[PDB]
What we know:
Chain D: It is found in: Cytoplasm. Chain D: Belongs to the eukaryotic ribosomal protein eS4 family. Chain D: Its main location: cytoplasm. Chain D: Keywords: Cytoplasm, Isopeptide bond, Phosphoprotein, Ribonucleoprotein, Ribosomal protein, RNA-binding, rRNA-binding, Ubl conjugation. The structure is cut from a larger assembly and holds chains A, B, C, D, E and F. Chain A is low in regular secondary structure. Chain A starts with 27 loop residues before the first helix and ends in a 5-residue tail after the last helix. Chain A is 14% helix and 0% strand. Chain B is mainly β. The radius of gyration of chain B is 20 Å and the shape is globular. Chain F folds into two domains: 30 residues, no CATH class; 108 residues, no CATH class. In chain F, strands 4-3-7-6-5 form a five-stranded mixed beta sheet. The longest helix of chain F is centred in the middle third of the chain and has 10 residues. Chain F binds two RNA strands through loops.
Amino acid sequence: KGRKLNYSVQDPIANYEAPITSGYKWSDDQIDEFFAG
Amino acid sequence: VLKSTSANDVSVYQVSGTNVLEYQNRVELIQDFEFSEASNKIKVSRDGQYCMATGTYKPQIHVYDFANLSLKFDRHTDAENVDFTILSWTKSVHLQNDRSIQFQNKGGLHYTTRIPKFGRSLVYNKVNCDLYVGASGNELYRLNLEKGRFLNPFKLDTEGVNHVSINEVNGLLAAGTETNVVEFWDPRSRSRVSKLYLENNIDNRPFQVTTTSFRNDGLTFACGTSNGYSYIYDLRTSEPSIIKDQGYGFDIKKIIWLDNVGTENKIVTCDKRIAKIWDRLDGKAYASMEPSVDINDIEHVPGTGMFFTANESIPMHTYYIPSLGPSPRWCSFLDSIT
Amino acid sequence: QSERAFQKQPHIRWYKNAGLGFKTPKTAIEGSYIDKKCPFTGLVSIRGKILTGTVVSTKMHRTIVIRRAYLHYIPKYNRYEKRHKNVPVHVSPAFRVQVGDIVTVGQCRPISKTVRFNVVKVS
Amino acid sequence: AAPHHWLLDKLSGCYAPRPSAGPHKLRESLPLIVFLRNRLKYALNGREVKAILMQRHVKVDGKVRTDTTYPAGFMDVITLDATNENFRLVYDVKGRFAVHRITDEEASYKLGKVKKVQLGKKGVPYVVTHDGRTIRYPDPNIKVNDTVKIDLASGKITDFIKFDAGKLVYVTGGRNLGRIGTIVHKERHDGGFDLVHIKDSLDNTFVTRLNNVFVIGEQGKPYISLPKG
Amino acid sequence: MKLNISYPVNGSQKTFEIDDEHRIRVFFDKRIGQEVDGEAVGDEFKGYVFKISGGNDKQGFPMKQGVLLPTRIKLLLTRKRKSVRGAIVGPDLAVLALVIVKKGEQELEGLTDTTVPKRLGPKRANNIRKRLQRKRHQRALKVRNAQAQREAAAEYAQLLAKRLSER
Amino acid sequence: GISRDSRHKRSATGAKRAQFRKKRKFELGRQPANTKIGAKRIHSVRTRGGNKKYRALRIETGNFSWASEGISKKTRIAGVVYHPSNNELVRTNTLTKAAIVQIDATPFRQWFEAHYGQTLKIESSVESQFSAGRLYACISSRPGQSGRCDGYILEGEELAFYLRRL
RNA sequence: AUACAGUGAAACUGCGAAGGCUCAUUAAAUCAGUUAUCGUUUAUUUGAUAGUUCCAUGGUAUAACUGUGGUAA
RNA sequence: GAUGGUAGGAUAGUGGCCUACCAUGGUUUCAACGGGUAACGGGGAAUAAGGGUUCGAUUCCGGAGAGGGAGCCUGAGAAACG
């Protein structure tokens, strides 16, 4: 289990991308009233 | 004028087939489209050019510029690939047959990391930026591109998963397992929401679901199998489905929608030898795309009616449908030759 | 005597002789032991030089860690500081070597990263 | 830039002649330019030793072999047509190449240490020597380090000298390089310092290797003639 | 535009500087190999048909037969990135090459009525139409090589047999 | 592949401060060509002068050997069920050396009926495959180096030697 | 010397150049000798080393070359 | 991959060189592993000179580089000064 699942932090991917604020065009209330069931 | 195969009252064309006066009336679209005797996986980027085709022996990356009709480069990667995605333009992430993951850049090979078990599929999340990678066993991992950490891997069932996909407009994480359960996780909560089971009427042997897909309405889900049987799903009475046996039926690998061009409610299914296309709400075949060799997978270019396969021969086939749509702006005399 | 897959067998029960003053025990000529890298039946051939010494540890299987103290005529501080050496070595079906046990080995065909020697004698 | 064996005077030049490839190794041979030009002095420079090589006077091992850097190693009988020059060159006692002059019935042959006997392909016994004369079919009792006698008109082995305790041996290699006397002792070890030991004027003792020694005859009767002083 | 025209069987070729581009516009958006009529490029050459065979544009860049995209693109040729104009002809060709495969209604005092001959007759025997002593010597040296080698091999194998009998 | 050198890794003593060298030509690790089933395509690569090496990727016509008589005859390939040099290799169904792959044994039926007359002394758990058609057989040849698929059939002892495993 | 016949610009060919500066500091891991490779590659050097045949000579496709041209090149 | 075992991959082949599985090993006070320079100096690396006694002949400081990293190709030999 040596090289298997190193839970470390890696240098070039720490800022490889950037997030997005709104993201999903739905609402989270639309998620809840989408899969209530 | 390129020849057309017979079909149900409809026409398709191939460019760069196994057969494709002919030398002096050549109809070659993309120069140097041939690999080392097979093809792994082809997909077209989000913008209007720069398609990427993974390699076969000494496997490469093969980015083709559509506005130059030829090859840009071929980064001979270290191992043979199975699955990758493209992250806009120049960045892309890959995983090979061994449990390693490459990050290609403009300079190429920005990093090589690993996952602890052998992986089978990769998808990227546009929202908060964590790639989900499906592998063998209890383990569906994350590599977040925010801060490069690892995340608390998603606890699966026994054997594993053949394909993972997230929904686009709302984010519903699919994971096609082996024991017919589809294991929908929530990309918000990091927990399960449902464990939907897949049924049939023939039941040859305990099939495994191999292809998962969604579209940009966020309400339906296209499901596959290891038997050649397409499935549709909705939340509306989610226990049954509509099914599609295919006339040869080995393993369907690519099921993709037509949710961004005209001639709507249509979907492409693709198993090992044939790729067909049918309509929703009836289940009747619009057309089919029978080549002269097997298919490793396919892809469909957005906005227009053309398809790009990755197969087991030396070139790759492109399939043009002059009834689904036109040929794109960089191929804007295909409608003049045929 | 079969705890692994892939047809554990001799590779053409089988028997040979390296010669050069080293016996082959009768179970190593005709016995159920496979002798994959033990040089009497083996796949390896003998060459080179033969070194002798006692052991330190035989903890893992197919690892015989020899010690080898030897005389060297030191001219610097005009006294002999005592030598010590180590070499890992694969097993043989002739002696379960315990601590002590001056044995000798012959050079052949690198088996792991650091072993070129395999046991040929116990006395 | 020279070795010790050539007997090469230091006031000669800057670049030393590398021998070309051939029968013997680089480290145990002298080429024809260092033979003819600056040892027994049939030339004055490389131009005229190439001139007499184009004229083809040299007849080493019964063939002409017109080349400047042809590596004549141990006891290749250099034969020169004018003034019937027959030269067997052996080792002296201090490491150089002593080139003895011999006659025609002695230059009609040479001898060679056998290196290995092989069942190579198609049931053919097989023998090699230091010039690599792969000659067909000796007897089965050719061990390593015995001595064949080459025909030098055809290639066949004519006589055979068995390596055992009580044979006249020549040592070419290590710190015993070029000694004769072959009897104080025999000691075959199992991988090194294994040999037959050689006497001196006071019958001193010496250690060498098996491959660094090879037999030339018997205790008093070698059919090679040897130089003296 | 300039039109290079070639009558191949007579061996004639000449360029013609044709202005007045609505005569030229018959060739537009027709790639290499597709035929054409004389009727919409001219009136004085009617019943004429020309297979186009490429052409250098202004800036001199050639077109190779049958790719796409009548602008310029950067391909990989005999392998390095060379610039090559597309096979389709548009408004910006300097010269355009043509092969006339049927004479129509007017004789041409450059193409039809004047012609050149060929170069020189053939040289090979079969090209003119459409040793044995070496065959003696080859066979003789071959059977002599057999009667030397395959007999000498057994002739020292019998010496091995003598050594084995004496051993 | 990458390499063949001890310089990138630690020895039996535990050393550090490697930072050694630009890797040479003679540390050449080529890519692992996992040979599969397809249409027969062998890449002819070069090494060490004119040392052509046959790198097989999609070989079919396996020459598999009847064991008790040693009859190497021609057949097809189905799939490897057990090969724990990589337990994902049998999930992906490749074809490497020492793998146990399944064969439609119809030419072995032809040879038995041709040199024995009747159809069916041989073991029963391989007589079941004599009847059905698919027999287990293990690859000997190296398609990644010699480009060929040769093998030996499973007959009795070696059969149960693998059937008790998986 | 009425199918070749000497000078020979420019083209194919055989080979030529067959081993040259600056910059950051490795403790038998850089180096030197030595053991071995039936554990391996090898142009050139050298010695050796080939046995399956039913009812007078095989095909177009490219040069150089001519000819028509484009481009500032 | 630390130490070894079994098999495969790649190799010019030997080789945890790389990967699956398994065992928890291995070096060390008989000096492990680590600390620096008159490591522009040293180690015979070599020629020695008929009186210079650590000046006094040379191979090599370490590896790289052909604007910068990356990928590929050629050859008996290369990760090419072309």
